[PDB]
């Protein structure tokens, strides 16, 4: 079904617009392993992240064609869809580079 095209260490955040604050995705602070999964049958991509500790899925987001991926800093990247704003606070610049490369590749071939 789906192939992982990258793995990156990041704390996954979502933006609480009513309170103007970032909050941990899934409700629990800490780092996750964040994949981009490619579904080859229909050429779709998804961001799926799981907490290192307890394997909880904290993000499971489609990547639509035309997404604006904002590399705010070398270690915090973010994007939005029609409901939520997502942020990734990467564990290193290398993790940020790996993930942005895969994301940019996804956006090119979509």
């Amino acid at each position: 079904s789906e192939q992982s095209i990258c793995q990156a260490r990041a704390a996954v955040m979502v933006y609480d617009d009513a309170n103007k604050k970032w909050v941990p995705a899934g409700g629990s602070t800490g780092f996750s392993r964040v994949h981009i999964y490619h579904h080859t049958g229909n050429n779709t991509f998804r961001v799926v992240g799981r907490k290192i500790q307890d394997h909880q899925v904290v993000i499971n987001c489609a990547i639509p064609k035309g997404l604006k991926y904002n590399q705010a800093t070398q270690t915090f990247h973010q994007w939005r869809d029609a409901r939520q704003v997502y942020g990734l606070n990467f564990g290193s610049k290398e993790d940020a580079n790996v993930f942005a490369s895969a994301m940019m590749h996804a956006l090119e071939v979509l």
């Binding site: 103007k20 704003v85 942020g87 606070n89």
Partner: peptide, 7 residues
């Protein structure tokens, strides 16, 4: 896009 988080 919102500013990046803090400590």
């Amino acid at each position: 896009x919102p500013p990046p988080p803090t400590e």
